[PDB]
Amino acid sequence: DDPILQIAIDNSRNILYTRSEKGVIQVYDLGQDGQGMSASVSQNAIVSAAGNIARTIDRSVFKIVQIAVI
């Protein structure tokens, strides 16, 4: 995506997360020499992920409201 709607930081693991308008997530490893990445989760990844349940996570319906680091 296009813009980065939200930014989140995992304090415990020094990991950066970015959520874009489109709903793609990117998690950079924060290192002394810079950011290392960027792995991504997308709607496609999620679909593959469920592999057992689906509907609310429909393509049309699918959108991400918020992301929180654990």
UniProtKB/Swiss-Prot annotation:
Phosphorylated. Phosphorylation and dephosphorylation may be important for the function of NUP155 and may play a role in the reversible disassembly of the nuclear pore complex during mitosis. Disulfide-linked to NUP62. The inner channel of the NPC has a different redox environment from the cytoplasm and allows the formation of interchain disulfide bonds between some nucleoporins, the significant increase of these linkages upon oxidative stress reduces the permeability of the NPC. It comes from the Eukaryota. Expressed in all tissues tested, including heart, brain, placenta, lung, liver, skeletal muscle, kidney and pancreas. It is found in: Nucleus, Nuclear pore complex; Nucleus membrane. It is linked to Atrial fibrillation, familial, 15: A familial form of atrial fibrillation, a common sustained cardiac rhythm disturbance. Atrial fibrillation is characterized by disorganized atrial electrical activity and ineffective atrial contraction promoting blood stasis in the atria and reduces ventricular filling. It can result in palpitations, syncope, thromboembolic stroke, and congestive heart failure. Essential component of nuclear pore complex. Could be essessential for embryogenesis. Nucleoporins may be involved both in binding and translocating proteins during nucleocytoplasmic transport. Belongs to the non-repetitive/WGA-negative nucleoporin family. Interacts with GLE1. Able to form a heterotrimer with GLE1 and NUP42 in vitro. Forms a complex with NUP35, NUP93, NUP205 and lamin B. This is Nuclear pore complex protein Nup155. The chain holds residues 276 to 348 of 1391 of the full protein.
